[PDB]
Design an enzyme around this catalytic site. Sequence first.
Site, PDB file in Angstrom:
ATOM      1  N   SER B  16       0.830  -1.192   0.000  1.00 12.37           N
ATOM      2  CA  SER B  16       0.000   0.000   0.000  1.00 12.37           C
ATOM      3  C   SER B  16       0.866   1.244   0.000  1.00 12.37           C
ATOM      4  CB  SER B  16      -0.961  -0.049   1.121  1.00 12.37           C
ATOM      5  OG  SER B  16      -0.281  -0.136   2.344  1.00 12.37           O
ATOM      6  N   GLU B  18       0.746   5.650   0.600  1.00 11.46           N
ATOM      7  CA  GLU B  18       0.135   6.853   1.129  1.00 11.46           C
ATOM      8  C   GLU B  18       0.914   8.040   0.604  1.00 11.46           C
ATOM      9  OE1 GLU B  18      -0.366   6.916   5.368  1.00 11.46           O
ATOM     10  OE2 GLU B  18      -0.522   9.100   5.498  1.00 11.46           O
ATOM     11  N   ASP B 109      -2.904  15.283  14.644  1.00 15.66           N
ATOM     12  CA  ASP B 109      -1.991  15.975  15.549  1.00 15.66           C
ATOM     13  C   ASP B 109      -2.602  17.302  16.007  1.00 15.66           C
ATOM     14  OD1 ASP B 109       0.343  14.208  15.343  1.00 15.66           O
ATOM     15  OD2 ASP B 109       0.814  15.166  13.409  1.00 15.66           O
ATOM     16  N   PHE B 220      10.485  13.360  12.337  1.00 15.55           N
ATOM     17  CA  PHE B 220      10.438  11.921  12.618  1.00 15.55           C
ATOM     18  C   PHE B 220      10.563  11.626  14.121  1.00 15.55           C
ATOM     19  CE2 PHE B 220      12.269  10.694   8.162  1.00 15.55           C
ATOM     20  CZ  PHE B 220      11.020  10.778   7.601  1.00 15.55           C
ATOM     21  N   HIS B 270       3.290  -0.856   4.073  1.00 17.51           N
ATOM     22  CA  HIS B 270       2.673   0.437   3.758  1.00 17.51           C
ATOM     23  C   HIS B 270       3.777   1.477   3.574  1.00 17.51           C
ATOM     24  CE1 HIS B 270      -0.487   3.444   3.916  1.00 17.51           C
ATOM     25  NE2 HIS B 270       0.265   4.131   4.765  1.00 17.51           N
TER      26      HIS B 270
HETATM   27  C1  LIG Z   1      -0.796   5.060   9.264  1.00 16.40           C
HETATM   28  C2  LIG Z   1      -0.984   6.471   9.723  1.00 16.40           C
HETATM   29  C3  LIG Z   1      -1.696   7.367   8.954  1.00 16.40           C
HETATM   30  C4  LIG Z   1      -1.951   8.666   9.404  1.00 16.40           C
HETATM   31  N1  LIG Z   1      -2.678   9.506   8.583  1.00 16.40           N
HETATM   32  C5  LIG Z   1      -2.941  10.697   9.054  1.00 16.40           C
HETATM   33  C6  LIG Z   1      -3.761  11.586   8.270  1.00 16.40           C
HETATM   34  O1  LIG Z   1      -4.230  11.278   7.165  1.00 16.40           O
HETATM   35  N2  LIG Z   1      -3.946  12.824   8.779  1.00 16.40           N
HETATM   36  C7  LIG Z   1      -3.513  13.225  10.017  1.00 16.40           C
HETATM   37  O2  LIG Z   1      -3.795  14.375  10.410  1.00 16.40           O
HETATM   38  N3  LIG Z   1      -2.804  12.405  10.803  1.00 16.40           N
HETATM   39  C8  LIG Z   1      -2.508  11.221  10.327  1.00 16.40           C
HETATM   40  N4  LIG Z   1      -1.725  10.386  11.089  1.00 16.40           N
HETATM   41  C9  LIG Z   1      -1.161  10.917  12.345  1.00 16.40           C
HETATM   42  C10 LIG Z   1      -2.008  10.776  13.590  1.00 16.40           C
HETATM   43  O3  LIG Z   1      -3.170  11.612  13.452  1.00 16.40           O
HETATM   44  C11 LIG Z   1      -1.145  11.291  14.763  1.00 16.40           C
HETATM   45  O4  LIG Z   1      -0.062  10.379  14.996  1.00 16.40           O
HETATM   46  C12 LIG Z   1      -1.921  11.656  16.039  1.00 16.40           C
HETATM   47  O5  LIG Z   1      -1.123  12.401  16.943  1.00 16.40           O
HETATM   48  C13 LIG Z   1      -2.372  10.462  16.841  1.00 16.40           C
HETATM   49  O6  LIG Z   1      -3.484   9.843  16.185  1.00 16.40           O
HETATM   50  P1  LIG Z   1      -4.080   8.463  16.706  1.00 16.40           P
HETATM   51  O7  LIG Z   1      -5.267   8.151  15.844  1.00 16.40           O
HETATM   52  O8  LIG Z   1      -3.027   7.403  16.795  1.00 16.40           O
HETATM   53  O9  LIG Z   1      -4.554   8.904  18.156  1.00 16.40           O
HETATM   54  P2  LIG Z   1      -5.378   8.128  19.301  1.00 16.40           P
HETATM   55  O10 LIG Z   1      -5.423   6.686  19.029  1.00 16.40           O
HETATM   56  O11 LIG Z   1      -6.642   8.890  19.524  1.00 16.40           O
HETATM   57  O12 LIG Z   1      -4.417   8.363  20.561  1.00 16.40           O
HETATM   58  C14 LIG Z   1      -4.115   9.677  21.044  1.00 16.40           C
HETATM   59  C15 LIG Z   1      -3.498   9.576  22.427  1.00 16.40           C
HETATM   60  O13 LIG Z   1      -4.531   9.236  23.391  1.00 16.40           O
HETATM   61  C16 LIG Z   1      -4.189   8.032  24.070  1.00 16.40           C
HETATM   62  N5  LIG Z   1      -5.418   7.322  24.364  1.00 16.40           N
HETATM   63  C17 LIG Z   1      -6.185   6.589  23.492  1.00 16.40           C
HETATM   64  N6  LIG Z   1      -7.299   6.176  24.052  1.00 16.40           N
HETATM   65  C18 LIG Z   1      -7.270   6.690  25.346  1.00 16.40           C
HETATM   66  C19 LIG Z   1      -8.170   6.608  26.428  1.00 16.40           C
HETATM   67  N7  LIG Z   1      -9.357   6.014  26.343  1.00 16.40           N
HETATM   68  N8  LIG Z   1      -7.863   7.269  27.572  1.00 16.40           N
HETATM   69  C20 LIG Z   1      -6.686   7.918  27.622  1.00 16.40           C
HETATM   70  N9  LIG Z   1      -5.752   8.049  26.670  1.00 16.40           N
HETATM   71  C21 LIG Z   1      -6.114   7.407  25.545  1.00 16.40           C
HETATM   72  C22 LIG Z   1      -3.218   7.321  23.158  1.00 16.40           C
HETATM   73  O14 LIG Z   1      -2.441   6.416  23.892  1.00 16.40           O
HETATM   74  C23 LIG Z   1      -2.424   8.501  22.597  1.00 16.40           C
HETATM   75  O15 LIG Z   1      -1.427   8.959  23.499  1.00 16.40           O
HETATM   76  C24 LIG Z   1      -1.443   9.098  10.650  1.00 16.40           C
HETATM   77  C25 LIG Z   1      -0.697   8.192  11.423  1.00 16.40           C
HETATM   78  C26 LIG Z   1      -0.501   6.911  11.004  1.00 16.40           C
HETATM   79  C27 LIG Z   1       0.368   6.011  11.864  1.00 16.40           C
HETATM   80  N1  LIG Z   2       2.303  12.244  14.185  1.00 17.33           N
HETATM   81  C1  LIG Z   2       2.183  11.987  12.872  1.00 17.33           C
HETATM   82  N2  LIG Z   2       2.563  10.837  12.361  1.00 17.33           N
HETATM   83  C2  LIG Z   2       2.435  10.631  11.030  1.00 17.33           C
HETATM   84  C3  LIG Z   2       1.881  11.638  10.179  1.00 17.33           C
HETATM   85  C4  LIG Z   2       1.588  12.894  10.712  1.00 17.33           C
HETATM   86  O1  LIG Z   2       1.247  13.913  10.062  1.00 17.33           O
HETATM   87  N3  LIG Z   2       1.772  13.027  12.069  1.00 17.33           N
HETATM   88  N4  LIG Z   2       1.731  11.278   8.807  1.00 17.33           N
HETATM   89  C5  LIG Z   2       0.559  11.495   8.167  1.00 17.33           C
HETATM   90  O2  LIG Z   2      -0.349  12.192   8.671  1.00 17.33           O
HETATM   91  C6  LIG Z   2       2.737  10.358   8.235  1.00 17.33           C
HETATM   92  C7  LIG Z   2       4.087  11.049   8.114  1.00 17.33           C
HETATM   93  N5  LIG Z   2       3.935  12.349   7.467  1.00 17.33           N
HETATM   94  C8  LIG Z   2       4.993  13.141   7.041  1.00 17.33           C
HETATM   95  C9  LIG Z   2       4.699  14.413   6.550  1.00 17.33           C
HETATM   96  C10 LIG Z   2       5.710  15.215   6.092  1.00 17.33           C
HETATM   97  C11 LIG Z   2       7.034  14.791   6.162  1.00 17.33           C
HETATM   98  C12 LIG Z   2       8.177  15.668   5.721  1.00 17.33           C
HETATM   99  O3  LIG Z   2       9.182  15.157   5.243  1.00 17.33           O
HETATM  100  N6  LIG Z   2       8.027  16.998   5.848  1.00 17.33           N
HETATM  101  C13 LIG Z   2       9.137  17.918   5.640  1.00 17.33           C
HETATM  102  C14 LIG Z   2       8.612  19.309   5.265  1.00 17.33           C
HETATM  103  C15 LIG Z   2       8.392  19.424   3.766  1.00 17.33           C
HETATM  104  C16 LIG Z   2       7.689  20.676   3.272  1.00 17.33           C
HETATM  105  O4  LIG Z   2       7.780  21.713   3.967  1.00 17.33           O
HETATM  106  O5  LIG Z   2       7.066  20.614   2.182  1.00 17.33           O
HETATM  107  C17 LIG Z   2      10.059  17.939   6.869  1.00 17.33           C
HETATM  108  O6  LIG Z   2       9.583  17.588   8.032  1.00 17.33           O
HETATM  109  O7  LIG Z   2      11.224  18.280   6.624  1.00 17.33           O
HETATM  110  C18 LIG Z   2       7.320  13.542   6.690  1.00 17.33           C
HETATM  111  C19 LIG Z   2       6.313  12.715   7.125  1.00 17.33           C
HETATM  112  C20 LIG Z   2       2.796   9.110   9.111  1.00 17.33           C
HETATM  113  N7  LIG Z   2       2.817   9.447  10.528  1.00 17.33           N
END
Ligand SMILES: Cc1cc2nc3c(=O)[nH]c(=O)nc-3n(C[C@H](O)[C@H](O)[C@H](O)COP(=O)(O)OP(=O)(O)OC[C@H]3O[C@@H](n4cnc5c(N)ncnc54)[C@H](O)[C@@H]3O)c2cc1C
Ligand SMILES: Nc1nc2c(c(=O)[nH]1)N(C=O)[C@@H](CNc1ccc(C(=O)N[C@@H](CCC(=O)O)C(=O)O)cc1)CN2
Lengths: 291, 291
Positions: B16, B18, B109, B220, B270
């Site tokens: 997959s 993304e 985030d 990262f 992925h």
């Molecule tokens: C595969 C992948 C794809 C992603 N795609 C996107 C995207 O498209 N757009 C984007 O904005 N972000 C994306 N992210 C980033 C993600 O939104 C961030 O990492 C965010 O900070 C955490 O999201 P989460 O769904 O894991 O949070 P959650 O699972 O809601 O967890 C948030 C926090 O709350 C804690 N927690 C959970 N349940 C409870 C509870 N019941 N009581 C107390 N604490 C609890 C967890 O341990 C954690 O510390 C992606 C991340 C991954 C890994």
């Molecule tokens: N907490 C968290 N985890 C996540 C995401 C996220 O947004 N937040 N992502 C999905 O939601 C994926 C990672 N997303 C990424 C987004 C940008 C860059 C990156 O290289 N950005 C550059 C800035 C580039 C620019 O300014 O155009 C950098 O950090 O240098 C890396 C990973 C997977 N995990």
Amino acid sequence: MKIRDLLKARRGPLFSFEFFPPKDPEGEEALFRTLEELKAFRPAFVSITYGAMGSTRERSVAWAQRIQSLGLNPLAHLTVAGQSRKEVAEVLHRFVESGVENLLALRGDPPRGERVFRPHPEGFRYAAELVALIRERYGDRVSVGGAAYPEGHPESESLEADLRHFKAKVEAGLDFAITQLFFNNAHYFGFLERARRAGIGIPILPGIMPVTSYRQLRRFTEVCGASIPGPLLAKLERHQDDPKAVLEIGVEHAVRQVAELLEAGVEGVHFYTLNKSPATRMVLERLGLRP
Amino acid sequence: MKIRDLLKARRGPLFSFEFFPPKDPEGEEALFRTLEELKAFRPAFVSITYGAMGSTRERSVAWAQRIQSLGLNPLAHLTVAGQSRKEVAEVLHRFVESGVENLLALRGDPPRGERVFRPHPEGFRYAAELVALIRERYGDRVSVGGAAYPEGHPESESLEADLRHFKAKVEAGLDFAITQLFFNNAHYFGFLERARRAGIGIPILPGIMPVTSYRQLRRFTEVCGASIPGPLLAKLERHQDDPKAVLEIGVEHAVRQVAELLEAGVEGVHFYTLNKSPATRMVLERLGLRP
Ligand SMILES: Cc1cc2nc3c(=O)[nH]c(=O)nc-3n(C[C@H](O)[C@H](O)[C@H](O)COP(=O)(O)OP(=O)(O)OC[C@H]3O[C@@H](n4cnc5c(N)ncnc54)[C@H](O)[C@@H]3O)c2cc1C
Ligand SMILES: Nc1nc2c(c(=O)[nH]1)N(C=O)[C@@H](CNc1ccc(C(=O)N[C@@H](CCC(=O)O)C(=O)O)cc1)CN2
Ligand SMILES: Cc1cc2nc3c(=O)[nH]c(=O)nc-3n(C[C@H](O)[C@H](O)[C@H](O)COP(=O)(O)OP(=O)(O)OC[C@H]3O[C@@H](n4cnc5c(N)ncnc54)[C@H](O)[C@@H]3O)c2cc1C
Ligand SMILES: Nc1nc2c(c(=O)[nH]1)N(C=O)[C@@H](CNc1ccc(C(=O)N[C@@H](CCC(=O)O)C(=O)O)cc1)CN2
Ligand SMILES: [Cl-]
Ligand SMILES: [Cl-]
Ligand SMILES: [Cl-]
């Protein structure tokens, strides 16, 4: 202590050591001096392999006793090959009556490297039947392990069938498992993932045997069913006539294997230790794990 | 097809991809030309990252529709940050009515340049609450994934707490999970073992992002929570001002990671792919997966 309890309690990875029936009286005394020296490594448990067809049935009970009298924790290996169900149950009874709390329930190989296993006429066919016997007779008063095969038993038709059979053995009443030796960590991690998807939660300890002689490769591949990764095989082939080089290659490979396993959170490592070989202690020393 | 079904019926690993919101119309057309070219590779599913705080809420639905119209299988990412429950439910409904069968339920985030997550006053706080909504409102009409964190969310108190919350999310109705990017495979394998001992059996797909620039390491480590193994970090520190060399370092590191994951029989990989970066394509070429 029961191994299931040692695993639940651990302050760090459990290290265990399996030796082999000695070939002569001097060798037997040397093995027990080695076990005495082995306290330096604080082993979680120690064992001596059981002769597959029951050739060591009396000696093995006396060895379990001698291990306990050294203050070490014996894991008693017991097989079903070549023995009646009554004969197996008698040995089991003697181990437990001796104070043994930990049993490794095994089938045994067919003799002389034959491909097809045939049970003793009034005997068991599968290790799971011995697991079930132990539970019927002793319940949870002992801890029971069995063998796991990350690369599959040689005689299995597929890794999928092999895992189903493992799950059946777990369900007979295992508390833990120890794997067949392997040289490619990915295959151990792959087996754990298959186990997780199958709903198996018990501790599964990786078994490690460093390569110490080139001659071993035939047994490792043909009997044990382990694969030798490309880089390792090439190094051993290049140095096959240099025993000192081979030992160093095997130790270095096992050190790198064990370092990754530990980083990946394994509960322990089980070291298959030829009686006169320092290789497994060399691995722990090189990783800074000698207390 | 539903990802749960693709996983059950898989004949080898699922791959997959993304991508990220394009920044202008030519970038958008270029991204969809990249996706059209990707069809020949037969990815299991493809996605575009859902913008922070709902900033792409209409475009993301149109992009999932455009992915479908190319004959690709979209995974719709959906977050809860910065939006009411009713708003989230509306975007969710738009995805489902578009024929999207696959949702990745996420929190989001905190907004750019903020370190603390605060839910919208009429919004969800946790991804699990969205998982629960999806199950209550659509049931088996969709397959739902969530994020997993082998090294823990940065804001979690401990890995133990993190895993407990992951389990609660799974129990709310996940069919699968995809991990946060990682650079040390042992931390992924260790997470799988923790998950196994906690009785979590769902497929968990490793997420891989090759290092393409030294500047990425801040995000990262601080935002994604990933550790950079010492040897990798050394090489990058030395070549910061040589981007060509950094790309090569990242690509080679990712190749070695993925080779081992594939040997470990992961259910899929992925890839997090910057829209204009060739790094993922280079990884697949070096692995022999693409010409
Ligand atoms: C595969 C992948 C794809 C992603 N795609 C996107 C995207 O498209 N757009 C984007 O904005 N972000 C994306 N992210 C980033 C993600 O939104 C961030 O990492 C965010 O900070 C955490 O999201 P989460 O769904 O894991 O949070 P959650 O699972 O809601 O967890 C948030 C926090 O709350 C804690 N927690 C959970 N349940 C409870 C509870 N019941 N009581 C107390 N604490 C609890 C967890 O341990 C954690 O510390 C992606 C991340 C991954 C890994
Ligand atoms: N907490 C968290 N985890 C996540 C995401 C996220 O947004 N937040 N992502 C999905 O939601 C994926 C990672 N997303 C990424 C987004 C940008 C860059 C990156 O290289 N950005 C550059 C800035 C580039 C620019 O300014 O155009 C950098 O950090 O240098 C890396 C990973 C997977 N995990
Ligand atoms: C840690 C460890 C220690 C060992 N110690 C000893 C020792 O002390 N002495 C010794 O002689 N050997 C020992 N062995 C070797 C072991 O005896 C051999 O590898 C033997 O060939 C298989 O033993 P098992 O207990 O795994 O067999 P089993 O678990 O009984 O399996 C035998 C075969 O039957 C198949 N099978 C199981 N259930 C079913 C079913 N329901 N339907 C169909 N097929 C099925 C299995 O997949 C396998 O192919 C040890 C092995 C290990 C890994
Ligand atoms: N199938 C199977 N797996 C098993 C065992 C076994 O007997 N059968 N073992 C336990 O039951 C352990 C491996 N036992 C071993 C026993 C000897 C040698 C070995 O190196 N033998 C030398 C010859 C030694 C001699 O003749 O003194 C060799 O093959 O070169 C290696 C592994 C773990 N797994
Ligand atoms: Cl088995
Ligand atoms: Cl509806
Ligand atoms: Cl989580």
